[PDB]
Nucleic acid binder design. Structure first.
Ligand SMILES: Nc1ncnc2c1ncn2[C@H]1C[C@H](O)[C@@H](COP(=O)(O)NP(=O)(O)OP(=O)(O)O)O1
Ligand SMILES: [Mg+2]
Ligand SMILES: [Mg+2]
Length: 430
DNA sequence: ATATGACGCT
DNA sequence: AGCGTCAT
Protein backbone atom coordinates (compact mmCIF):
# COMPACT_ATOMS: atom_id res chain seq x y z
CA UNK A 1 0.00 0.00 0.00
CA UNK A 2 2.29 2.79 1.32
CA UNK A 3 5.35 1.08 -0.25
CA UNK A 4 3.74 0.05 -3.53
CA UNK A 5 5.41 1.13 -6.77
CA UNK A 6 3.08 2.96 -9.14
CA UNK A 7 5.47 3.83 -11.96
CA UNK A 8 4.73 7.54 -11.79
CA UNK A 9 8.31 8.75 -11.37
CA UNK A 10 8.79 9.90 -14.96
CA UNK A 11 7.12 11.96 -17.61
CA UNK A 12 7.81 10.41 -21.00
CA UNK A 13 6.56 11.25 -24.49
CA UNK A 14 6.56 9.48 -27.82
CA UNK A 15 6.32 11.78 -30.84
CA UNK A 16 5.50 10.12 -34.16
CA UNK A 17 5.23 11.86 -37.55
CA UNK A 18 1.88 11.50 -39.28
CA UNK A 19 2.18 9.53 -42.56
CA UNK A 20 5.80 10.69 -42.61
CA UNK A 21 7.14 9.85 -46.13
CA UNK A 22 3.87 11.21 -47.57
CA UNK A 23 4.31 14.52 -45.71
CA UNK A 24 7.91 14.75 -46.96
CA UNK A 25 6.78 14.33 -50.60
CA UNK A 26 3.75 16.60 -50.06
CA UNK A 27 5.92 19.40 -48.71
CA UNK A 28 8.10 19.23 -51.83
CA UNK A 29 5.15 18.83 -54.25
CA UNK A 30 2.15 21.04 -53.27
CA UNK A 31 0.03 19.13 -55.83
CA UNK A 32 0.02 16.10 -53.51
CA UNK A 33 -1.28 18.11 -50.52
CA UNK A 34 -4.74 17.40 -49.08
CA UNK A 35 -5.14 14.50 -51.48
CA UNK A 36 -5.26 10.72 -51.29
CA UNK A 37 -1.67 9.79 -51.89
CA UNK A 38 0.91 7.15 -51.20
CA UNK A 39 4.62 6.68 -51.40
CA UNK A 40 5.60 3.71 -53.55
CA UNK A 41 8.87 1.76 -53.93
CA UNK A 42 9.82 0.63 -57.45
CA UNK A 43 7.27 0.49 -60.29
CA UNK A 44 7.57 -2.58 -62.50
CA UNK A 45 6.09 -5.29 -60.31
CA UNK A 46 2.42 -4.31 -59.92
CA UNK A 47 3.06 -0.56 -59.83
CA UNK A 48 5.43 -0.87 -56.88
CA UNK A 49 5.07 -1.44 -53.15
CA UNK A 50 3.32 1.15 -51.01
CA UNK A 51 5.22 2.05 -47.83
CA UNK A 52 3.31 5.15 -46.67
CA UNK A 53 -0.29 6.31 -47.04
CA UNK A 54 -1.94 9.68 -46.50
CA UNK A 55 -5.02 9.70 -44.30
CA UNK A 56 -7.18 10.73 -47.24
CA UNK A 57 -6.07 7.55 -49.01
CA UNK A 58 -6.50 5.40 -45.85
CA UNK A 59 -10.20 6.27 -45.84
CA UNK A 60 -10.37 4.34 -49.16
CA UNK A 61 -8.69 1.31 -47.57
CA UNK A 62 -5.24 1.88 -49.02
CA UNK A 63 -2.61 0.31 -46.78
CA UNK A 64 1.12 -0.20 -46.46
CA UNK A 65 2.59 -3.19 -48.36
CA UNK A 66 -0.30 -2.94 -50.82
CA UNK A 67 0.79 -2.95 -54.49
CA UNK A 68 0.15 0.37 -56.22
CA UNK A 69 -2.00 -1.30 -58.93
CA UNK A 70 -4.18 -2.84 -56.23
CA UNK A 71 -4.40 0.44 -54.29
CA UNK A 72 -5.64 2.16 -57.47
CA UNK A 73 -8.59 -0.30 -57.61
CA UNK A 74 -9.67 0.93 -54.17
CA UNK A 75 -8.80 4.53 -54.97
CA UNK A 76 -8.64 5.58 -58.64
CA UNK A 77 -7.75 9.22 -57.82
CA UNK A 78 -4.76 8.04 -55.76
CA UNK A 79 -1.65 10.15 -56.31
CA UNK A 80 1.78 8.52 -56.06
CA UNK A 81 5.29 9.66 -55.30
CA UNK A 82 8.19 7.29 -55.93
CA UNK A 83 11.09 6.67 -53.65
CA UNK A 84 14.30 7.82 -55.28
CA UNK A 85 16.15 4.95 -56.89
CA UNK A 86 19.97 5.09 -56.91
CA UNK A 87 22.23 2.37 -58.32
CA UNK A 88 19.21 0.11 -58.80
CA UNK A 89 18.02 0.33 -55.24
CA UNK A 90 15.75 2.40 -53.04
CA UNK A 91 17.51 5.50 -51.70
CA UNK A 92 15.92 6.80 -48.52
CA UNK A 93 18.17 9.87 -48.13
CA UNK A 94 15.33 12.39 -48.41
CA UNK A 95 13.44 10.86 -45.46
CA UNK A 96 16.59 10.48 -43.35
CA UNK A 97 17.39 14.16 -43.85
CA UNK A 98 13.77 15.11 -43.12
CA UNK A 99 14.04 12.96 -39.99
CA UNK A 100 17.11 14.86 -38.84
CA UNK A 101 15.14 18.15 -39.24
CA UNK A 102 12.56 16.89 -36.76
CA UNK A 103 14.98 15.29 -34.29
CA UNK A 104 17.00 18.49 -34.03
CA UNK A 105 13.93 20.51 -33.07
CA UNK A 106 12.84 17.96 -30.44
CA UNK A 107 16.38 17.81 -29.01
CA UNK A 108 16.12 21.50 -28.08
CA UNK A 109 13.38 20.71 -25.54
CA UNK A 110 14.87 17.63 -23.92
CA UNK A 111 16.87 14.40 -24.23
CA UNK A 112 15.45 12.17 -26.98
CA UNK A 113 15.82 8.56 -27.99
CA UNK A 114 15.51 8.08 -31.75
CA UNK A 115 13.25 5.04 -32.04
CA UNK A 116 12.73 4.99 -35.79
CA UNK A 117 13.20 7.25 -38.80
CA UNK A 118 10.00 9.10 -37.76
CA UNK A 119 9.70 8.89 -33.99
CA UNK A 120 11.50 9.59 -30.74
CA UNK A 121 10.89 9.17 -27.04
CA UNK A 122 11.36 12.17 -24.79
CA UNK A 123 12.16 12.27 -21.09
CA UNK A 124 10.37 15.45 -19.94
CA UNK A 125 10.75 14.90 -16.18
CA UNK A 126 13.41 17.60 -15.71
CA UNK A 127 11.67 20.05 -18.05
CA UNK A 128 8.35 19.50 -16.24
CA UNK A 129 10.02 20.17 -12.85
CA UNK A 130 11.54 23.46 -13.99
CA UNK A 131 8.39 24.52 -15.82
CA UNK A 132 6.52 23.80 -12.54
CA UNK A 133 8.77 26.12 -10.49
CA UNK A 134 8.37 28.84 -13.15
CA UNK A 135 4.63 28.27 -12.78
CA UNK A 136 3.87 28.14 -9.07
CA UNK A 137 0.20 27.75 -8.21
CA UNK A 138 -0.80 29.07 -11.63
CA UNK A 139 -3.73 27.00 -12.94
CA UNK A 140 -3.32 25.48 -16.39
CA UNK A 141 -5.60 26.99 -18.99
CA UNK A 142 -7.19 24.67 -21.55
CA UNK A 143 -5.78 27.08 -24.18
CA UNK A 144 -2.32 25.71 -23.40
CA UNK A 145 -3.56 22.30 -24.49
CA UNK A 146 -5.35 22.93 -27.84
CA UNK A 147 -4.80 19.49 -29.43
CA UNK A 148 -4.55 17.32 -26.29
CA UNK A 149 -6.91 14.38 -25.47
CA UNK A 150 -7.22 13.05 -21.93
CA UNK A 151 -7.66 9.30 -22.31
CA UNK A 152 -10.75 7.96 -20.51
CA UNK A 153 -12.41 11.38 -20.27
CA UNK A 154 -15.10 12.67 -20.41
CA UNK A 155 -16.81 10.23 -18.06
CA UNK A 156 -20.13 10.17 -16.17
CA UNK A 157 -22.82 12.86 -15.67
CA UNK A 158 -22.02 16.56 -27.40
CA UNK A 159 -21.86 14.70 -30.70
CA UNK A 160 -18.74 16.37 -32.12
CA UNK A 161 -15.17 15.03 -31.88
CA UNK A 162 -13.72 18.36 -30.80
CA UNK A 163 -16.64 18.75 -28.41
CA UNK A 164 -15.80 15.44 -26.76
CA UNK A 165 -12.11 16.41 -26.61
CA UNK A 166 -12.81 19.64 -24.80
CA UNK A 167 -15.27 18.14 -22.31
CA UNK A 168 -12.71 15.59 -21.16
CA UNK A 169 -9.98 18.25 -20.98
CA UNK A 170 -12.28 20.43 -18.85
CA UNK A 171 -13.09 17.53 -16.49
CA UNK A 172 -9.38 16.77 -16.21
CA UNK A 173 -8.25 20.34 -15.58
CA UNK A 174 -11.05 20.99 -13.08
CA UNK A 175 -9.90 17.96 -11.09
CA UNK A 176 -6.19 18.89 -10.96
CA UNK A 177 -4.46 19.58 -7.64
CA UNK A 178 -2.29 22.52 -8.76
CA UNK A 179 -0.68 23.21 -5.36
CA UNK A 180 1.00 19.80 -5.25
CA UNK A 181 4.14 20.06 -7.39
CA UNK A 182 4.67 16.30 -6.95
CA UNK A 183 1.24 15.17 -8.19
CA UNK A 184 1.94 12.79 -11.11
CA UNK A 185 -1.21 13.94 -12.87
CA UNK A 186 -0.07 17.56 -12.78
CA UNK A 187 3.39 16.56 -14.02
CA UNK A 188 1.84 14.74 -17.01
CA UNK A 189 -0.33 17.78 -17.71
CA UNK A 190 2.71 20.06 -17.73
CA UNK A 191 4.39 17.43 -19.86
CA UNK A 192 1.52 17.74 -22.35
CA UNK A 193 1.90 21.53 -22.41
CA UNK A 194 5.54 21.21 -23.42
CA UNK A 195 4.69 18.61 -26.09
CA UNK A 196 2.12 21.03 -27.58
CA UNK A 197 5.01 23.50 -27.84
CA UNK A 198 7.41 20.91 -29.31
CA UNK A 199 4.73 19.94 -31.82
CA UNK A 200 3.96 23.56 -32.65
CA UNK A 201 7.69 24.16 -33.22
CA UNK A 202 8.04 21.05 -35.41
CA UNK A 203 5.13 22.15 -37.57
CA UNK A 204 6.21 25.80 -37.75
CA UNK A 205 9.76 24.94 -38.76
CA UNK A 206 9.28 21.91 -41.02
CA UNK A 207 5.66 22.03 -42.15
CA UNK A 208 5.29 18.47 -40.84
CA UNK A 209 2.46 17.45 -38.49
CA UNK A 210 2.77 14.71 -35.89
CA UNK A 211 1.03 12.97 -33.05
CA UNK A 212 2.34 12.31 -29.55
CA UNK A 213 1.62 10.27 -26.43
CA UNK A 214 2.36 11.58 -22.94
CA UNK A 215 2.57 9.20 -20.01
CA UNK A 216 4.86 7.76 -17.31
CA UNK A 217 6.80 5.32 -19.48
CA UNK A 218 7.68 4.44 -23.06
CA UNK A 219 5.10 1.70 -23.57
CA UNK A 220 2.16 3.83 -22.41
CA UNK A 221 3.53 6.86 -24.28
CA UNK A 222 3.81 4.90 -27.55
CA UNK A 223 0.32 3.36 -27.01
CA UNK A 224 -1.17 6.80 -26.18
CA UNK A 225 0.27 8.33 -29.37
CA UNK A 226 -1.77 6.03 -31.61
CA UNK A 227 -5.10 6.65 -29.87
CA UNK A 228 -5.82 10.00 -31.53
CA UNK A 229 -3.62 10.17 -34.65
CA UNK A 230 -3.36 12.24 -36.81
CA UNK A 231 -2.31 15.72 -35.65
CA UNK A 232 -3.28 15.20 -31.99
CA UNK A 233 -1.65 14.25 -28.70
CA UNK A 234 -3.00 12.02 -25.94
CA UNK A 235 -2.32 11.98 -22.21
CA UNK A 236 -2.61 8.53 -20.62
CA UNK A 237 -2.60 8.87 -16.85
CA UNK A 238 -1.72 6.16 -14.37
CA UNK A 239 -5.38 6.17 -13.28
CA UNK A 240 -6.65 5.63 -16.83
CA UNK A 241 -4.78 2.34 -17.16
CA UNK A 242 -7.24 -0.14 -15.61
CA UNK A 243 -10.06 0.74 -18.00
CA UNK A 244 -7.80 1.24 -21.02
CA UNK A 245 -6.08 -2.09 -20.51
CA UNK A 246 -9.38 -3.86 -19.76
CA UNK A 247 -10.26 -4.15 -23.47
CA UNK A 248 -6.79 -3.59 -24.86
CA UNK A 249 -5.68 -6.57 -27.01
CA UNK A 250 -2.36 -7.90 -25.70
CA UNK A 251 -0.77 -7.51 -29.18
CA UNK A 252 -1.14 -3.72 -29.13
CA UNK A 253 1.44 -3.30 -26.38
CA UNK A 254 5.03 -2.72 -27.60
CA UNK A 255 7.09 -5.98 -27.79
CA UNK A 256 3.95 -8.09 -27.37
CA UNK A 257 3.06 -7.85 -31.06
CA UNK A 258 4.78 -11.11 -32.05
CA UNK A 259 5.37 -14.65 -30.75
CA UNK A 260 5.67 -13.71 -27.05
CA UNK A 261 2.31 -11.95 -27.19
CA UNK A 262 0.71 -14.90 -29.00
CA UNK A 263 2.25 -17.12 -26.36
CA UNK A 264 0.91 -15.00 -23.48
CA UNK A 265 -2.56 -15.32 -25.02
CA UNK A 266 -2.25 -19.04 -25.81
CA UNK A 267 -0.71 -20.28 -22.56
CA UNK A 268 -2.77 -18.09 -20.21
CA UNK A 269 -6.01 -18.19 -22.17
CA UNK A 270 -6.54 -14.42 -22.11
CA UNK A 271 -7.09 -11.63 -24.66
CA UNK A 272 -6.57 -8.28 -22.97
CA UNK A 273 -3.71 -6.63 -21.15
CA UNK A 274 -5.64 -6.14 -17.90
CA UNK A 275 -6.18 -9.87 -17.46
CA UNK A 276 -2.47 -10.28 -16.70
CA UNK A 277 -2.97 -8.72 -13.24
CA UNK A 278 -4.53 -11.85 -11.76
CA UNK A 279 -1.23 -13.75 -12.10
CA UNK A 280 1.66 -13.55 -9.63
CA UNK A 281 5.10 -12.47 -10.79
CA UNK A 282 6.43 -15.99 -10.22
CA UNK A 283 3.65 -17.51 -12.32
CA UNK A 284 4.51 -15.09 -15.12
CA UNK A 285 8.24 -15.78 -14.82
CA UNK A 286 7.62 -19.55 -14.87
CA UNK A 287 5.81 -19.25 -18.25
CA UNK A 288 7.84 -16.53 -19.94
CA UNK A 289 11.16 -16.40 -18.10
CA UNK A 290 12.51 -14.23 -15.27
CA UNK A 291 12.95 -11.09 -17.40
CA UNK A 292 9.64 -11.36 -19.28
CA UNK A 293 7.55 -12.32 -16.25
CA UNK A 294 8.92 -9.42 -14.21
CA UNK A 295 8.29 -7.04 -17.10
CA UNK A 296 4.75 -8.36 -17.72
CA UNK A 297 3.81 -8.20 -14.04
CA UNK A 298 4.68 -4.52 -13.85
CA UNK A 299 3.49 -3.59 -17.39
CA UNK A 300 -0.10 -4.83 -16.95
CA UNK A 301 -0.31 -2.38 -14.01
CA UNK A 302 0.96 0.42 -16.26
CA UNK A 303 4.47 0.19 -14.87
CA UNK A 304 7.62 -0.03 -16.99
CA UNK A 305 11.18 1.03 -16.31
CA UNK A 306 12.95 1.00 -19.69
CA UNK A 307 14.75 4.33 -19.72
CA UNK A 308 14.66 6.90 -22.50
CA UNK A 309 18.14 6.35 -23.91
CA UNK A 310 20.07 9.50 -24.70
CA UNK A 311 20.73 8.62 -28.35
CA UNK A 312 19.68 10.78 -31.31
CA UNK A 313 21.90 8.97 -33.82
CA UNK A 314 21.56 5.38 -35.16
CA UNK A 315 24.22 2.89 -33.93
CA UNK A 316 24.53 1.05 -37.24
CA UNK A 317 24.51 2.25 -40.84
CA UNK A 318 23.15 -0.25 -43.29
CA UNK A 319 22.21 -0.99 -46.87
CA UNK A 320 20.00 -3.81 -48.07
CA UNK A 321 18.01 -5.02 -51.07
CA UNK A 322 15.74 -8.03 -51.59
CA UNK A 323 15.84 -9.97 -54.84
CA UNK A 324 12.44 -11.71 -54.95
CA UNK A 325 11.28 -14.58 -57.15
CA UNK A 326 12.87 -14.68 -60.59
CA UNK A 327 15.26 -11.86 -59.80
CA UNK A 328 17.23 -13.88 -57.25
CA UNK A 329 20.98 -13.62 -57.88
CA UNK A 330 22.32 -16.84 -59.37
CA UNK A 331 25.73 -15.94 -60.82
CA UNK A 332 28.94 -14.83 -59.12
CA UNK A 333 28.91 -11.72 -61.36
CA UNK A 334 25.50 -10.62 -60.12
CA UNK A 335 26.39 -11.09 -56.48
CA UNK A 336 29.61 -9.09 -56.83
CA UNK A 337 27.98 -6.30 -58.82
CA UNK A 338 25.22 -5.77 -56.27
CA UNK A 339 27.65 -5.99 -53.35
CA UNK A 340 29.43 -3.15 -55.08
CA UNK A 341 26.18 -1.18 -55.51
CA UNK A 342 25.30 -1.62 -51.83
CA UNK A 343 28.88 -0.80 -50.76
CA UNK A 344 28.95 2.41 -52.80
CA UNK A 345 25.81 3.80 -51.13
CA UNK A 346 27.20 2.68 -47.79
CA UNK A 347 30.47 4.52 -48.45
CA UNK A 348 28.54 7.69 -49.31
CA UNK A 349 26.58 7.52 -46.04
CA UNK A 350 29.56 6.46 -43.91
CA UNK A 351 31.60 9.38 -45.25
CA UNK A 352 28.69 11.73 -44.61
CA UNK A 353 28.35 10.27 -41.12
CA UNK A 354 32.03 10.69 -40.28
CA UNK A 355 32.02 14.39 -41.27
CA UNK A 356 28.67 15.00 -39.54
CA UNK A 357 28.89 13.01 -36.29
CA UNK A 358 32.64 12.64 -35.79
CA UNK A 359 32.78 8.84 -35.62
CA UNK A 360 34.10 5.90 -37.63
CA UNK A 361 32.54 2.45 -38.12
CA UNK A 362 34.98 -0.39 -37.46
CA UNK A 363 33.03 -3.55 -38.36
CA UNK A 364 31.27 -4.68 -41.54
CA UNK A 365 28.47 -7.20 -41.18
CA UNK A 366 27.44 -9.07 -44.31
CA UNK A 367 24.06 -10.76 -44.34
CA UNK A 368 22.41 -12.85 -47.05
CA UNK A 369 19.12 -14.63 -47.58
CA UNK A 370 18.90 -17.71 -49.80
CA UNK A 371 15.95 -18.96 -51.87
CA UNK A 372 13.52 -21.07 -49.84
CA UNK A 373 14.58 -19.70 -46.47
CA UNK A 374 11.85 -17.57 -44.90
CA UNK A 375 14.01 -16.02 -42.14
CA UNK A 376 15.12 -12.39 -42.48
CA UNK A 377 18.73 -13.60 -42.70
CA UNK A 378 20.03 -17.02 -43.69
CA UNK A 379 23.58 -16.09 -42.70
CA UNK A 380 25.60 -13.27 -41.09
CA UNK A 381 29.37 -12.89 -41.26
CA UNK A 382 31.68 -9.97 -40.38
CA UNK A 383 35.07 -8.54 -41.26
CA UNK A 384 37.08 -5.50 -40.23
CA UNK A 385 35.98 -2.16 -41.61
CA UNK A 386 39.27 -0.30 -41.99
CA UNK A 387 38.73 1.97 -44.99
CA UNK A 388 35.65 3.79 -46.26
CA UNK A 389 36.12 2.36 -49.76
CA UNK A 390 33.26 0.67 -51.57
CA UNK A 391 35.46 -1.56 -53.72
CA UNK A 392 37.34 -2.86 -50.69
CA UNK A 393 34.15 -3.25 -48.68
CA UNK A 394 32.35 -5.19 -51.44
CA UNK A 395 35.35 -7.45 -52.18
CA UNK A 396 35.72 -8.07 -48.42
CA UNK A 397 32.02 -8.89 -48.20
CA UNK A 398 32.26 -11.30 -51.10
CA UNK A 399 35.26 -12.91 -49.41
CA UNK A 400 33.41 -13.81 -46.22
CA UNK A 401 30.24 -15.11 -47.92
CA UNK A 402 31.65 -16.83 -51.03
CA UNK A 403 31.85 -20.28 -49.37
CA UNK A 404 28.07 -20.24 -48.93
CA UNK A 405 28.02 -21.08 -52.62
CA UNK A 406 27.01 -24.75 -53.12
CA UNK A 407 27.64 -24.55 -56.88
CA UNK A 408 29.83 -26.96 -58.85
CA UNK A 409 30.16 -24.33 -61.57
CA UNK A 410 32.48 -21.44 -60.73
CA UNK A 411 30.50 -18.74 -62.56
CA UNK A 412 27.19 -19.73 -60.95
CA UNK A 413 25.75 -19.08 -57.52
CA UNK A 414 23.52 -21.55 -55.72
CA UNK A 415 21.38 -21.46 -53.77
CA UNK A 416 20.08 -18.25 -55.37
CA UNK A 417 20.27 -15.18 -53.14
CA UNK A 418 17.09 -13.30 -52.25
CA UNK A 419 18.73 -10.61 -50.05
CA UNK A 420 22.06 -8.84 -49.76
CA UNK A 421 22.70 -6.65 -46.70
CA UNK A 422 25.72 -4.57 -45.71
CA UNK A 423 25.84 -3.05 -42.25
CA UNK A 424 28.58 -0.87 -40.78
CA UNK A 425 28.68 -1.17 -36.96
CA UNK A 426 30.92 -0.84 -33.87
CA UNK A 427 31.52 2.90 -34.13
CA UNK A 428 34.44 4.63 -32.46
CA UNK A 429 34.94 8.38 -31.86
CA UNK A 430 36.75 10.27 -34.63
C1' DA B 1 7.11 -10.21 -54.85
C1' DT B 2 5.60 -7.83 -46.89
C1' DA B 3 14.61 -1.00 -46.36
C1' DT B 4 16.35 -0.75 -42.52
C1' DG B 5 17.26 -0.53 -37.11
C1' DA B 6 17.64 -2.18 -31.98
C1' DC B 7 18.26 -5.69 -28.90
C1' DG B 8 17.98 -10.63 -26.60
C1' DC B 9 19.88 -15.40 -26.35
C1' DT B 10 23.56 -18.49 -26.42
C1' DA C 1 30.09 -14.65 -32.79
C1' DG C 2 26.07 -15.79 -35.04
C1' DC C 3 21.13 -16.40 -34.83
C1' DG C 4 16.32 -14.99 -33.27
C1' DT C 5 12.67 -11.47 -32.16
C1' DC C 6 10.31 -7.28 -32.82
C1' DA C 7 9.89 -3.14 -34.72
C1' DT C 8 8.83 1.19 -38.41
N1 LIG D 1 7.58 -1.95 -42.90
C1 LIG D 1 8.10 -0.76 -43.47
N2 LIG D 1 8.88 -1.00 -44.53
C2 LIG D 1 9.46 0.04 -45.20
N3 LIG D 1 9.25 1.33 -44.79
C3 LIG D 1 8.46 1.58 -43.72
C4 LIG D 1 7.89 0.55 -43.07
N4 LIG D 1 7.16 1.05 -42.04
C5 LIG D 1 7.26 2.40 -42.07
N5 LIG D 1 8.07 2.74 -43.10
C6 LIG D 1 8.40 4.05 -43.42
C7 LIG D 1 7.42 4.71 -44.07
C8 LIG D 1 6.69 5.56 -42.99
O1 LIG D 1 6.21 6.74 -43.42
C9 LIG D 1 7.80 5.80 -41.91
C10 LIG D 1 7.18 5.91 -40.52
O2 LIG D 1 6.44 4.72 -40.25
P1 LIG D 1 5.10 4.77 -39.39
O3 LIG D 1 5.23 5.78 -38.29
O4 LIG D 1 4.92 3.40 -38.88
N6 LIG D 1 3.81 5.15 -40.32
P2 LIG D 1 3.50 6.65 -40.91
O5 LIG D 1 4.42 7.68 -40.26
O6 LIG D 1 3.64 6.65 -42.43
O7 LIG D 1 2.01 6.90 -40.60
P3 LIG D 1 1.41 7.14 -39.15
O8 LIG D 1 2.54 7.18 -38.14
O9 LIG D 1 0.66 8.44 -39.16
O10 LIG D 1 0.50 5.98 -38.93
O11 LIG D 1 8.60 4.76 -41.97
MG1 LIG E 1 4.48 7.83 -38.21
MG1 LIG F 1 6.67 5.70 -36.43
Amino acid sequence: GPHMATGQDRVVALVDMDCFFVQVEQRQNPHLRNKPCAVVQYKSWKGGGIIAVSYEARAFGVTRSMWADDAKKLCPDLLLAQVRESRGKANLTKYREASVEVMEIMSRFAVIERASIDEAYVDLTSAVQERLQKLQGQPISADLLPSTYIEGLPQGPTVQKEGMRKQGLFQWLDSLQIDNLTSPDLQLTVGAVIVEEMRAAIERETGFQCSAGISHNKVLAKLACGLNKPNRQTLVSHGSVPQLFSQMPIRKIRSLGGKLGASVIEILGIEYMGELTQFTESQLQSHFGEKNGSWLYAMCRGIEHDPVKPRQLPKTIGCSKNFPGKTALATREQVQWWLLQLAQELEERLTKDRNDNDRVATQLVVSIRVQGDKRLSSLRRCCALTRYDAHKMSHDAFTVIKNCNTSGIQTEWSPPLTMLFLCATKFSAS
